[PDB]
XYZ file of C-alpha atoms in Angstrom:
658
model
C 137.188 127.566 79.815
C 138.219 130.143 82.571
C 135.497 132.271 83.868
C 136.066 136.165 82.804
C 134.281 136.709 86.277
C 133.858 135.089 89.429
C 132.879 136.517 92.835
C 131.130 135.183 96.008
C 129.859 135.689 99.387
C 127.137 138.360 98.324
C 124.223 139.401 100.668
C 121.419 140.562 99.371
C 119.408 142.326 101.772
C 116.952 144.454 99.523
C 119.855 146.290 98.326
C 121.132 145.904 94.870
C 124.868 145.305 94.239
C 126.772 146.786 91.439
C 129.361 144.610 89.554
C 129.466 146.390 86.228
C 132.898 147.467 86.479
C 134.528 144.054 87.227
C 131.956 142.385 84.389
C 130.538 144.431 81.634
C 134.093 144.999 79.752
C 134.763 141.315 80.251
C 131.819 140.262 77.826
C 132.688 139.015 74.665
C 130.820 136.901 71.734
C 127.235 135.860 71.549
C 127.216 132.918 73.812
C 127.137 132.768 77.511
C 127.047 130.540 80.529
C 126.221 131.735 83.920
C 126.719 129.501 87.217
C 125.520 130.825 90.606
C 125.236 129.245 93.709
C 122.666 131.085 95.920
C 120.326 130.973 99.016
C 116.880 132.441 99.426
C 114.968 131.020 102.637
C 112.863 134.319 102.994
C 112.327 135.553 99.351
C 110.371 138.276 98.365
C 107.391 137.634 95.992
C 109.620 138.311 92.917
C 113.304 138.811 92.956
C 115.921 139.235 90.491
C 119.414 137.133 91.429
C 121.107 138.891 88.267
C 120.637 141.508 86.103
C 122.354 142.779 82.688
C 120.417 146.022 82.088
C 120.475 149.668 80.117
C 119.852 151.414 83.078
C 119.012 154.706 80.601
C 115.715 156.638 80.477
C 113.710 155.260 77.563
C 115.143 151.843 77.611
C 113.629 149.855 80.765
C 112.684 147.073 77.998
C 116.416 146.106 77.573
C 117.693 143.742 80.217
C 118.449 140.170 80.950
C 117.308 139.021 83.911
C 117.529 136.015 86.313
C 114.691 135.655 88.566
C 112.710 133.721 91.209
C 109.135 133.944 92.617
C 108.524 132.759 96.443
C 106.435 129.657 94.765
C 109.688 128.317 93.937
C 109.580 129.515 90.007
C 113.004 129.968 88.577
C 113.071 131.817 84.816
C 114.660 134.572 82.597
C 113.745 137.707 81.003
C 115.931 138.433 77.687
C 114.562 141.893 76.096
C 115.335 144.197 73.812
C 113.141 147.166 72.328
C 115.234 147.860 69.169
C 115.307 144.287 68.139
C 112.019 143.383 69.049
C 112.451 140.634 71.460
C 110.559 140.262 74.669
C 111.523 136.515 76.042
C 110.490 135.082 79.082
C 111.255 131.545 79.943
C 110.446 129.904 83.502
C 109.598 126.790 85.341
C 107.617 126.736 88.723
C 108.774 124.355 91.630
C 112.502 124.665 90.601
C 114.297 125.469 94.025
C 114.561 124.347 97.393
C 114.397 126.746 100.440
C 115.703 125.390 103.433
C 116.394 121.766 104.580
C 117.133 120.538 108.461
C 116.939 124.304 109.759
C 119.335 125.710 107.136
C 119.169 127.642 103.835
C 119.990 125.599 101.049
C 122.440 126.150 98.589
C 120.905 126.121 94.913
C 122.904 125.546 92.171
C 121.774 127.236 88.997
C 123.502 127.281 85.582
C 122.004 129.058 82.707
C 123.486 128.411 79.117
C 122.853 131.227 76.360
C 123.944 129.151 73.048
C 124.033 131.648 69.941
C 125.069 128.428 67.360
C 121.960 126.421 68.484
C 119.654 129.537 69.010
C 118.729 127.992 72.463
C 118.505 128.905 76.239
C 118.749 126.239 78.648
C 118.248 126.381 82.711
C 119.475 123.848 85.340
C 118.777 124.120 88.967
C 120.284 121.425 91.225
C 121.427 119.283 88.689
C 118.114 119.454 86.803
C 117.120 120.474 83.571
C 113.882 122.789 84.292
C 113.869 124.373 80.570
C 115.517 124.557 77.096
C 113.990 126.789 74.515
C 115.084 127.074 70.929
C 114.000 130.537 68.895
C 114.333 131.347 65.568
C 115.522 135.145 66.097
C 118.304 134.909 68.833
C 119.165 137.498 71.484
C 122.782 137.175 72.948
C 122.433 138.172 76.727
C 125.415 140.319 75.682
C 124.060 142.209 72.665
C 121.077 143.876 74.340
C 121.020 147.672 72.966
C 123.041 149.749 75.607
C 123.800 147.524 78.433
C 125.622 149.470 80.910
C 124.733 147.735 84.524
C 125.471 144.319 85.595
C 123.720 144.064 88.886
C 122.992 141.583 91.625
C 119.819 141.340 93.547
C 118.108 143.618 91.181
C 117.562 144.990 87.990
C 118.306 148.561 87.342
C 115.893 150.011 84.777
C 115.344 153.793 84.310
C 118.016 154.349 87.388
C 115.712 152.207 89.813
C 116.144 148.629 91.473
C 113.390 146.735 90.407
C 112.716 142.942 91.770
C 114.940 143.863 94.673
C 115.806 140.436 96.213
C 116.421 139.060 99.667
C 119.115 136.044 99.786
C 122.409 135.475 99.212
C 124.950 134.440 96.352
C 127.853 132.439 97.462
C 129.296 132.130 94.302
C 128.998 133.587 90.949
C 130.766 132.792 87.507
C 130.510 133.802 83.685
C 131.919 132.212 80.965
C 132.130 133.529 77.086
C 131.038 130.124 76.129
C 127.759 127.873 76.093
C 129.164 125.100 77.979
C 127.958 121.560 76.963
C 125.350 119.234 78.883
C 128.276 117.221 79.675
C 130.457 119.930 81.311
C 127.480 120.953 83.011
C 127.086 118.005 84.808
C 130.574 118.056 86.387
C 129.878 121.244 88.356
C 129.825 120.339 92.067
C 126.206 120.117 93.815
C 124.941 120.913 97.453
C 121.369 119.216 96.769
C 119.457 118.356 100.027
C 117.724 115.569 98.050
C 118.537 112.945 95.588
C 116.227 111.378 92.666
C 115.074 107.661 92.615
C 113.228 108.134 89.550
C 114.112 110.220 87.074
C 113.695 111.223 83.141
C 115.585 109.665 81.141
C 115.718 106.181 83.276
C 115.075 102.938 82.249
C 111.165 103.652 82.648
C 111.566 106.272 79.736
C 108.627 108.079 81.089
C 109.276 111.924 81.542
C 107.014 112.166 84.454
C 106.519 110.299 87.986
C 103.829 110.488 90.234
C 102.332 108.882 93.456
C 105.529 107.617 95.398
C 105.686 105.059 97.589
C 108.172 103.436 100.151
C 108.284 100.598 102.500
C 110.871 99.311 104.457
C 111.357 95.309 104.009
C 112.497 92.531 106.749
C 115.833 92.272 104.884
C 116.448 96.046 105.477
C 116.131 96.792 101.710
C 113.845 99.430 100.810
C 111.464 99.722 98.269
C 109.955 102.154 96.356
C 107.064 102.194 93.634
C 105.800 105.030 91.627
C 103.519 106.105 88.548
C 105.976 106.252 85.940
C 103.359 108.725 83.517
C 104.180 109.339 80.001
C 101.448 111.643 78.660
C 102.334 114.477 80.773
C 101.793 114.336 84.649
C 97.720 113.687 83.859
C 95.791 111.074 85.657
C 94.429 108.251 83.684
C 92.962 108.322 80.633
C 96.638 108.167 79.850
C 99.687 105.973 79.603
C 101.339 105.006 82.911
C 103.110 101.892 83.883
C 104.053 101.103 87.913
C 107.512 101.121 88.154
C 109.980 100.244 91.270
C 113.294 101.027 92.619
C 115.032 99.637 96.041
C 117.976 100.466 97.855
C 120.069 98.016 100.240
C 122.077 100.856 101.980
C 119.458 102.645 103.774
C 118.383 105.005 100.901
C 121.662 106.338 100.192
C 121.611 104.527 96.560
C 118.874 103.191 94.314
C 118.306 100.463 91.883
C 117.670 101.391 87.914
C 113.783 101.301 87.978
C 112.171 98.077 86.507
C 108.362 97.825 85.916
C 105.975 96.345 88.583
C 102.969 96.660 86.090
C 103.117 97.541 82.357
C 100.702 97.458 79.175
C 102.463 97.851 75.538
C 99.660 98.862 73.539
C 101.434 102.222 73.186
C 104.843 103.049 72.895
C 107.080 103.940 76.260
C 107.934 107.406 75.123
C 109.914 110.284 77.184
C 107.934 113.014 75.596
C 108.018 116.954 76.560
C 104.511 117.499 77.055
C 103.192 120.744 76.053
C 102.715 123.309 79.117
C 101.081 125.876 77.246
C 97.628 126.832 77.651
C 96.457 125.781 74.270
C 97.542 122.265 74.595
C 98.368 121.261 78.276
C 95.283 119.359 78.479
C 96.630 116.983 75.762
C 95.976 113.763 77.013
C 96.743 110.199 75.639
C 93.342 108.995 74.949
C 93.673 105.498 73.179
C 95.867 103.817 75.816
C 95.424 101.445 78.763
C 97.161 102.498 82.122
C 97.716 101.723 85.974
C 97.369 104.144 88.355
C 98.208 104.719 92.290
C 99.920 101.761 93.618
C 100.544 100.186 97.185
C 103.014 98.193 98.729
C 103.207 95.414 101.736
C 105.415 92.315 102.719
C 103.841 89.191 103.818
C 105.703 87.241 106.225
C 104.020 83.811 105.827
C 105.339 83.356 102.292
C 108.064 86.245 102.198
C 106.858 87.660 99.129
C 106.462 91.161 98.323
C 102.945 92.022 97.191
C 102.203 95.305 95.029
C 98.503 96.613 94.231
C 97.083 98.917 91.603
C 94.131 100.395 89.819
C 93.749 99.369 86.355
C 92.504 101.364 83.711
C 91.512 99.543 80.344
C 92.426 101.789 76.952
C 91.175 105.264 77.067
C 89.242 105.097 80.559
C 90.164 107.152 83.835
C 87.852 108.182 86.912
C 86.340 110.595 84.592
C 84.614 108.072 82.379
C 84.640 104.593 83.900
C 81.545 102.935 84.018
C 80.029 103.469 87.869
C 77.279 101.034 87.577
C 79.630 98.046 86.584
C 82.038 96.020 88.061
C 83.178 94.324 84.734
C 82.177 90.850 86.051
C 79.514 88.260 85.988
C 78.465 86.366 88.671
C 77.692 82.844 88.027
C 76.774 81.010 91.007
C 78.988 82.568 93.929
C 81.719 82.810 91.399
C 82.759 86.024 89.255
C 84.398 85.909 85.730
C 85.936 88.841 83.812
C 83.391 89.891 81.123
C 84.330 90.427 77.504
C 82.885 92.082 74.542
C 84.159 90.568 71.025
C 84.677 93.109 67.904
C 81.115 93.304 66.221
C 78.767 92.943 69.224
C 76.858 95.519 70.863
C 76.731 93.696 74.270
C 79.245 91.649 76.134
C 78.274 88.331 75.327
C 81.293 86.357 76.783
C 83.381 85.803 80.157
C 86.735 84.615 81.072
C 86.616 81.072 82.867
C 88.931 78.863 84.610
C 92.417 78.644 82.998
C 91.478 81.501 80.755
C 88.814 79.659 78.598
C 86.584 82.588 76.696
C 83.289 81.401 77.035
C 80.268 82.368 74.890
C 77.152 83.606 77.387
C 74.476 83.302 74.735
C 75.227 79.794 74.386
C 76.743 78.854 77.279
C 79.494 77.081 74.802
C 83.301 77.864 75.209
C 85.174 79.171 72.163
C 88.148 78.650 70.350
C 89.937 81.758 72.435
C 91.849 81.333 75.717
C 93.465 84.098 77.824
C 96.762 83.569 79.176
C 98.553 84.748 82.496
C 99.199 88.312 80.666
C 95.697 88.640 79.737
C 96.603 88.120 76.368
C 94.117 86.837 73.850
C 95.043 83.192 72.277
C 93.232 81.858 69.373
C 94.005 77.530 69.194
C 96.868 78.184 71.654
C 98.748 80.896 69.290
C 99.226 84.353 70.217
C 97.220 87.023 68.644
C 98.640 90.709 68.221
C 97.937 94.324 67.719
C 99.850 97.104 66.389
C 101.204 99.456 68.557
C 100.509 102.976 68.968
C 103.089 106.167 69.326
C 102.128 109.851 70.120
C 103.521 113.050 68.768
C 102.536 116.740 68.408
C 104.073 117.019 64.829
C 101.003 118.452 63.546
C 100.519 120.851 66.274
C 98.301 118.899 68.462
C 98.327 115.419 69.607
C 98.301 112.942 67.678
C 98.301 109.029 68.477
C 98.938 106.972 65.156
C 100.039 103.293 64.609
C 103.927 102.754 64.548
C 104.319 99.409 62.416
C 105.110 97.289 65.706
C 102.883 94.348 66.876
C 102.974 93.518 70.182
C 100.417 90.574 72.079
C 96.945 91.200 72.249
C 95.640 92.267 75.279
C 91.965 92.555 76.661
C 92.555 95.786 78.155
C 93.699 97.374 74.764
C 91.750 99.473 72.014
C 92.909 97.328 69.544
C 91.794 93.819 70.787
C 89.350 91.276 69.509
C 88.141 90.986 72.975
C 87.840 93.826 75.385
C 87.148 94.347 78.864
C 84.226 96.721 80.405
C 85.501 100.145 80.331
C 85.755 100.729 84.045
C 88.445 100.628 86.668
C 89.871 97.655 88.350
C 92.595 96.567 91.200
C 95.148 94.399 90.237
C 97.879 92.556 92.234
C 101.404 91.554 91.501
C 103.886 89.850 93.681
C 107.793 89.323 93.944
C 109.618 86.518 95.261
C 112.989 88.256 94.917
C 112.255 91.461 97.109
C 111.616 94.093 93.818
C 114.204 92.127 91.346
C 111.257 91.226 89.212
C 107.575 91.034 89.258
C 105.158 88.425 88.500
C 102.359 88.808 85.872
C 99.356 90.682 87.597
C 95.904 89.281 88.679
C 92.582 91.203 88.847
C 91.217 91.117 92.020
C 87.285 90.236 92.173
C 84.571 92.837 93.125
C 83.641 93.416 96.448
C 80.612 95.696 96.375
C 78.882 93.251 93.767
C 77.766 93.109 90.365
C 77.105 96.412 89.523
C 79.493 98.718 91.434
C 82.591 99.681 89.750
C 86.112 98.810 91.420
C 86.833 100.561 94.589
C 90.220 103.028 94.141
C 93.476 101.736 95.826
C 94.629 104.145 98.275
C 98.460 104.639 97.453
C 101.397 104.060 99.781
C 101.525 100.835 101.920
C 99.594 98.391 102.752
C 99.734 97.187 106.527
C 100.920 93.839 107.823
C 99.943 92.900 111.499
C 102.621 92.326 113.907
C 100.936 89.617 115.165
C 99.560 87.698 112.319
C 99.953 87.269 108.900
C 97.204 89.149 108.144
C 97.444 91.774 105.111
C 95.182 94.958 104.777
C 94.957 97.499 101.900
C 93.180 100.410 102.144
C 90.583 101.174 99.401
C 87.919 103.949 98.797
C 84.605 104.340 96.882
C 81.488 106.829 97.332
C 80.408 106.776 101.069
C 83.121 104.613 102.532
C 86.288 103.069 102.824
C 86.472 99.478 101.788
C 89.523 97.545 103.291
C 90.800 94.594 101.572
C 91.784 91.674 104.145
C 94.069 88.792 103.071
C 95.003 86.078 105.703
C 96.933 83.605 102.875
C 99.452 85.939 101.655
C 96.938 87.298 99.060
C 95.467 84.259 97.257
C 92.103 85.406 98.756
C 90.755 88.571 99.971
C 87.329 90.023 101.682
C 86.479 93.354 102.325
C 85.515 95.330 105.501
C 83.302 98.324 104.538
C 83.615 101.517 107.151
C 81.267 104.328 106.401
C 82.404 107.624 106.091
C 80.491 111.184 106.168
C 81.246 111.761 102.795
C 79.664 111.532 99.449
C 82.219 110.855 96.357
C 85.501 111.899 98.515
C 88.926 111.033 97.329
C 89.339 109.238 100.714
C 93.049 108.400 100.440
C 93.958 106.371 103.540
C 96.966 105.171 105.166
C 96.894 102.912 108.160
C 99.497 102.290 111.477
C 99.454 99.941 114.045
C 99.283 101.618 117.450
C 99.664 98.302 119.294
C 98.719 94.854 118.879
C 95.573 94.647 116.677
C 94.938 97.826 116.771
C 95.038 100.088 113.508
C 94.280 103.842 113.367
C 93.898 105.077 109.596
C 94.587 108.722 108.505
C 92.490 109.848 105.628
C 91.940 112.904 103.412
C 88.661 114.310 102.929
C 86.642 117.284 101.970
C 86.591 119.219 105.280
C 89.902 120.860 105.264
C 90.933 118.505 108.007
C 92.817 114.960 107.805
C 90.270 112.721 109.255
C 90.789 109.341 111.425
C 89.113 105.956 112.646
C 90.046 103.144 114.456
C 89.789 99.465 114.828
C 90.716 97.065 117.758
C 90.092 93.735 116.201
C 92.530 93.995 113.418
C 90.425 95.443 110.866
C 86.964 93.440 111.318
C 85.494 96.504 112.831
C 85.880 100.255 112.649
C 85.031 103.507 115.282
C 83.414 106.405 113.948
C 85.311 109.204 112.119
C 87.101 111.843 114.112
C 89.475 115.128 112.698
C 92.883 116.205 113.525
C 92.880 119.802 114.508
C 96.164 121.478 114.171
C 96.792 120.607 110.559
C 95.178 122.623 107.441
C 94.274 120.731 104.373
C 92.628 122.596 101.215
C 89.094 121.853 100.335
C 89.862 118.930 98.042
C 92.660 117.705 100.678
C 95.807 115.779 99.631
C 96.792 112.127 100.641
C 98.397 112.039 104.044
C 101.275 109.046 104.704
C 102.064 107.473 108.072
C 104.011 105.211 110.067
C 104.246 103.942 113.132
C 107.713 105.305 114.728
C 109.651 102.066 116.681
C 111.437 104.049 119.102
C 109.777 106.066 122.235
C 109.898 109.481 121.742
C 109.629 111.629 125.110
C 108.922 108.372 126.549
C 105.884 107.602 124.304
C 104.983 105.604 121.636
C 104.798 107.896 118.079
C 103.166 108.101 114.986
C 104.681 110.556 112.271
C 102.236 112.040 109.767
C 103.452 113.367 106.357
C 101.450 115.994 104.582
C 101.170 119.687 103.117
C 99.827 122.252 105.715
C 98.030 124.568 104.088
C 94.196 125.958 103.786
C 95.094 127.165 100.261
C 97.415 124.791 98.117
C 99.801 121.857 97.976
C 102.610 123.393 99.974
C 104.273 124.038 102.934
C 105.213 120.380 103.627
C 105.519 118.804 106.870
C 106.180 115.998 108.930
C 104.014 116.255 112.177
C 105.276 113.678 115.219
C 102.179 112.811 117.381
C 102.578 111.055 121.221
C 99.958 108.191 121.700
C 98.024 108.627 125.004
C 98.359 104.924 126.394
C 95.507 105.456 128.727
C 93.039 106.174 125.922
C 94.956 105.795 122.585
C 94.529 109.605 121.547
C 97.669 111.304 120.090
C 99.059 114.453 120.824
C 100.452 116.211 117.685
C 103.669 117.588 119.484
C 106.077 118.407 116.721
C 105.869 119.885 113.708
C 108.666 119.978 111.293
C 108.638 122.274 107.832
C 110.230 120.027 104.999
C 110.769 123.294 102.912
C 109.302 126.709 102.873
C 105.396 127.185 103.784
C 105.358 128.744 100.036
C 107.167 125.983 98.397
C 105.500 122.707 96.628
C 104.518 119.271 98.710
C 101.571 117.110 97.462
C 101.562 113.585 97.816
C 104.403 112.004 99.846
C 105.742 108.780 101.095
C 107.544 107.639 104.340
C 109.333 105.048 105.964
C 111.506 104.243 109.000
C 114.643 103.041 107.670
C 116.637 100.156 108.884
C 118.712 102.459 110.662
C 115.886 104.524 112.550
C 116.430 107.480 110.045
C 113.093 108.679 108.242
C 112.986 108.545 104.208
C 110.414 110.481 102.743
C 109.951 110.521 98.719
C 107.544 113.305 97.790
C 106.185 115.500 94.966
C 108.091 118.727 95.493
C 105.310 120.948 93.635
C 101.688 121.526 93.588
C 100.219 118.805 92.061
C 96.604 120.065 92.085
C 97.695 123.935 90.557
C 96.911 123.823 86.581
C 100.075 126.404 86.336
C 102.396 123.535 87.472
C 101.087 120.645 85.204
C 104.036 118.332 83.340
C 107.112 119.089 85.620
C 110.016 116.584 85.451
C 112.063 115.281 88.363
C 109.986 117.154 90.970
C 109.344 113.440 93.014
C 112.195 113.671 95.183
C 113.843 111.999 98.295
C 115.272 112.977 101.492
C 116.593 111.524 104.554
C 115.802 112.698 108.164
C 116.731 112.110 111.757
C 114.239 112.195 114.795
C 116.588 115.008 116.007
C 115.545 117.113 113.198
C 112.021 116.922 113.723
C 111.810 117.717 117.392
């Protein structure tokens, strides 16, 4: 179909543009599509890009609009007072503002489909909403429409929602164009997607990105594939990975690094309304918060993540139990059998389930997948699926049998309901992953697992030492392995915070000198230093010059391989805002060789101060560019839950930052 209207290079400077003569008599039929390429790097708080309205006195509620907010939210209003219809559809965090010093051309496609009674919005090739209604209102059939407007809506002769921005191209069609046709519209995106809705994971949500450049030049990414909306555990969440062999230009179809199968892998549109948005999958085991490192000795890639048994998360995990029993200097996973009111069993060498009351072994064994065997035969459980067909969340058996796992709700033998850390390895740089193993407890029998710091582990340059940061109440607990992750020890470092979410990432400033940057509850990023390869740790200092909220946000950090201004450089990635998870920046610091102090000299704004930026991953690509994979939304805001395709990847050069 040809457009009935096409126009371009409109400048919106707080003054609307009338296109009524050009457009209104071209409108026909009850289905329409609007395609609009626009820039808005200095938006007003609330502004309309396009309006169709009845401008006459007494008809102020008869209009259609496409609007945005300076938070990056996009939406439409479709209103007719005589028909008794007032629709408002929107989604937060749907826009880009600037990239590399230049306003981004956003490509918006809005489809108004009378036959399917559905309104669908795409921005930058991402479907941000699709809503079906019982009573359809064609945007062309609003009673008394007499104005078509760019950069405002004319209501009763006055300009409402005045815009600052530009519309480089706008087209309208008297047809609801198909999803196929939409996908052929050229985009001008500053970002790409690695993980996305409808991919191999079948998770509709993604959180907690990581990146790591392997010695072969392959760039590996891990992520939480989150199924029950964006909620932290308790939920259903798997850990997925993808890699790039061309410096981040293209990425492999994702595979799982860690997965559970007690619940179906379902792509679900999680409700965003206030009544149901806290709906949470409550019977599923999950993984959460992954971290990756490469081992020089074995050549293996190592991935760690937290593990949550069925229905467990931070909120309800037993704080005073590691889930292990010490039996002469060795720790064994405890198990509770169906019917018991105590944990009367342990898992021993070769997976033999032992009875503790009698110190007898049983006829049960645990395989390498943590699955229950009886007499060597696989036991099974029935899988669950979730649905909202009743109008609220239901989790119901689905007729499919899967192997019985000790982390499952329905298992004959069940682990302690607390958090664990697991490890898996890959011998083919992310093409496949081994079955995970649990790490032992590090803080004793009666302390829950520490929490893994997401992102990267650290492989020291001059040895085979591997370090993963974790945190718990009152300290960072570094996990150290010198034998390819076969065995681990802890190195504890006190921090002046009780129950902080002290997410920490490390850089090696020089040989054996590690600086750890971490989240706090003070509004400043903190740091500490080791000069003995992680054995001992300095007191805590704070960075002034970067602001975080009271609750804080993960910070990612790398040591750049090249000198900047003749100095060694560290790059940090974090929101810079005392108010919310927004105003993303890369901050380049130069190391003072005399004392290892860091002068934070350059700040690069990843997008507008008001646009969302939360957890992030950064890596130096093999070509010395910087790859950034990040949550482009406010992941703390209870208004921005359950958004799809907000974890996004960009490529930057040092020259862009400085």
